């Protein structure tokens, strides 16, 4: 699972859950397909090292990278463009793991996946491994610390008697997510209790309907609207505008929280600034 590195000493020998690579120190031509780790490059002052980004899925908080060469999207990866750039490192997360062999023929390929069962330790390991490549451990540790302090401030205000349900909307369908899922940080790190701790985890979640939401009667509903990312016309607010949901504590107290999908769905959890924004977004919704 974790990334491990030995100094060798114009490069590191690096092992991660997908394989092994010789990575040069201070790489100067990096193609990044994980949006969180791209934000981390910004935070570490490594902008000039980046030579390709998935411009098709570039969110509002990463527009300083809008003039970098495009390598397509996080799903629609453009291999010819990657190859034409002649990168010295490619950095990927779980969306691209199915392209690993093809990517690794072009250049050493680092996997920075987030472990849903161990979010914080994977986050730390991803960030510190990237910073090791550049001799920036001290800086990265200080910014990791600030994240921990933000986490403690958020936890401080959580009402231990209330419960939340996490849902994803897509076209007209609703699915639910719980602890240890792709959104589990809400329960697992920030301390917010779940209406159902036993939701089977899966990439796009457990299928449910409004009767189920009413039955659980959450105090907070956290909504990730995938429609926004795919450019469908439907919106979670429409799907949830019905009599079953309306009866819930969440609806009555206006605690149906539409989380920014450019952070939560595109999944920029590896970012030293973007993870802080997510933590703030939760905190401010429940304080």
Which residues lie near ligand EHS (CB under 6 A)? Answer: 74-75, 94-95, 203-204
Question: Which residues fall in the annotated binding site for Zn(2+)?
Answer: 142, 146, 160, 187, 197
Tell the smallest beta-carbon distance from residue 245 to ligand EHS (Å).
Answer: 24
Question: Which residues fall in the annotated binding site for Fe(3+)?
Answer: 204, 265
Question: Which residues fall in the annotated binding site?
Answer: 142, 146, 160, 187, 197, 204, 265
Residue with Cβ nearer ligand EHS (46 or 74): 74
CA 150 to chain CA centroid, nearest Å? 17
Task: Find tokens 């924004």 and name the residue.
Answer: 277
Tell the smallest beta-carbon distance from residue 278 to ligand EHS (Å).
Answer: 16
Tell the smallest beta-carbon distance from residue 92 to ligand EHS (Å).
Answer: 11
Tell the smallest beta-carbon distance from residue 182 to ligand EHS (Å).
Answer: 6
Q: How many CA atoms within 13 Å lie on the side-chain side of 220?
A: 23
Q: What whole-number distance in Å separates Cα of residue 256 and Cα of residue 102?
A: 42
Burial of 120 by CB count in 10 Å (0-12 exposed, 13-18 middle, 19+ buried)?
A: middle
Q: Name the phi and psi angles at 85, rounded to 5.
A: -75, -20
Within 8 A by CB and 6+ apart from 31, the residues are 50, 51, 52, 53, 71, 82, 85, 87, 89, 90, 91, 107
């Amino acid at each position: 699972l974790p990334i491990s590195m030995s100094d060798e000493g114009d490069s590191f020998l690096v092992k991660d859950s997908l394989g092994e690579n010789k990575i040069p120190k201070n790489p100067s031509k990096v193609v990044i397909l994980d949006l969180g780790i791209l934000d981390t490059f910004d935070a570490l002052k490594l902008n000039d090292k980046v030579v390709g980004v998935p411009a098709k899925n570039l969110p509002k908080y990463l527009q300083q990278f809008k003039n970098k060469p495009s390598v397509g999207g996080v799903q629609q990866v453009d291999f010819e463009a990657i190859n034409a750039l002649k990168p010295d490192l490619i950095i990927i997360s779980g969306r691209q793991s199915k392209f690993y062999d093809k990517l690794k023929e072009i250049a050493p390929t680092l996997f920075v996946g987030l472990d849903n069962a161990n979010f914080l330790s994977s986050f730390e390991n991803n960030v510190l491994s990237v910073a090791k490549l550049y001799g920036l451990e001290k800086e990265a540790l200080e910014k990791i610390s600030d994240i921990k302090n933000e986490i403690e401030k958020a936890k401080s205000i959580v009402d231990e008697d209330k419960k939340a349900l996490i849902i994803l909307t897509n076209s007209n369908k609703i699915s639910a997510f719980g602890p240890q899922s792709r959104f589990g940080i809400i329960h697992d790190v920030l301390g917010i209790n779940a209406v159902d701790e036993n939701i089977k985890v899966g990439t796009h979640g457990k299928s449910i309907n409004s009767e189920f939401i009413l039955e659980k009667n959450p105090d907070y509903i956290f909504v990730v609207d995938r429609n926004v990312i795919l450019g469908n016309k439907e919106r979670a607010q429409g799907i949830l505008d019905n009599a079953l949901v309306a009866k819930t504590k969440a609806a009555q107290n206006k605690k149906i929280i539409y989380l920014d999908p450019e952070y939560w769905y595109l999944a920029s959890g590896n970012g030293l600034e973007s993870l802080k924004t997510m933590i703030l977004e939760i905190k401010n919704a429940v304080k």
